């Protein structure tokens, strides 16, 4: 109903922004920067689990489906959230990983940092180009949680299909709020669902580098236990080609 509205629930369950504790007294190194970012990321993923448990409908899914969706989508959630923070703090000019850890053009020059930061900046630049509202962002972020699935389907497929329909309608409500006409509303829905589809390609490159760093420990970068457990499960499924994106537009 409207007391409370679903969108007000999404606003109140959004986690607070975490700080990194990064020590910038001495110069950066790619190893200590990436290890700091992985540790922050593990803490952000724990917050994302608490968020997902609070999402209306999510706990109607089989527990194994809840585990699968979070394991498959965590990088999309974290990159999208990073895009929003970077949009609000710097209009997408810098990557705001935490309020005490902002990556500018010079830190991107570190070894192995440039290509991954370029992909993350592209996400932030889309929020700028489309002038995404907070409520559009919140609805789109739920849909990312529901956008990467096993090819063999989920245990609670019918529940999942209904959850996805509910939050697609909620994104529509957030669009209509901007007070455009019906034709403008459909065009904006097209633009935002195209952005959602593009996240699979933009995040796929981030995952491949993450997987590479996890497996080969290039420069011996550390991962927290939370990410190491998820990555250890996610990588074989992705490598076997057993995962598929759910797309709004035919590819």
């Amino acid at each position: 109903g409207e007391f409370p509205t679903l969108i007000s629930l999404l606003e109140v369950i959004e986690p607070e922004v975490l700080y990194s504790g990064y020590d910038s007294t001495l110069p950066d190194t790619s190893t200590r920067l990436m290890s700091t970012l992985n540790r922050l990321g593990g803490r952000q993923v724990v917050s994302a689990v608490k968020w997902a448990k609070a999402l209306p409908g999510f706990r109607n899914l089989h527990l194994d489906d809840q585990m699968t969706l979070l394991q498959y989508s965590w990088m999309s959630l974290m990159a999208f959230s990073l895009g929003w923070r970077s949009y609000k703090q710097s209009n997408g000019n810098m990557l705001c990983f935490a309020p005490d850890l902002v990556i500018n053009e010079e830190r991107m020059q570190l070894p192995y940092m440039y290509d991954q930061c370029q992909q993350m900046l592209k996400i932030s630049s889309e929020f700028v180009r489309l002038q995404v509202s907070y409520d559009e962002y919140l609805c789109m972020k739920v849909l990312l949680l529901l956008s990467t699935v096993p090819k063999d389907g989920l245990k609670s497929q019918a529940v999942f299909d209904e959850i996805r329909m509910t939050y697609i309608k909620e994104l529509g409500k957030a669009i209509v709020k901007r007070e455009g006409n019906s034709s403008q509303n459909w065009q904006r829905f097209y633009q935002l669902t195209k952005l959602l589809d593009s996240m699979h390609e933009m995040v796929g490159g981030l995952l491949q580098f993450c997987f590479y760093t996890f497996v080969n420990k290039s420069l011996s970068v550390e991962f927290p236990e939370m990410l190491a457990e998820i990555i250890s499960n996610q990588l074989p499924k992705f490598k076997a080609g057993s995962v598929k994106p759910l797309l709004f537009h035919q590819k």
Binding site: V46, K53, L63, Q66, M67, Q71, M226, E229
Partner: peptide
């Protein structure tokens, strides 16, 4: 399989 994740989701 992932212990921390399962412990969190089990409440």
């Amino acid at each position: 399989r992932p212990a921390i994740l399962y412990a969190l989701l089990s409440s």
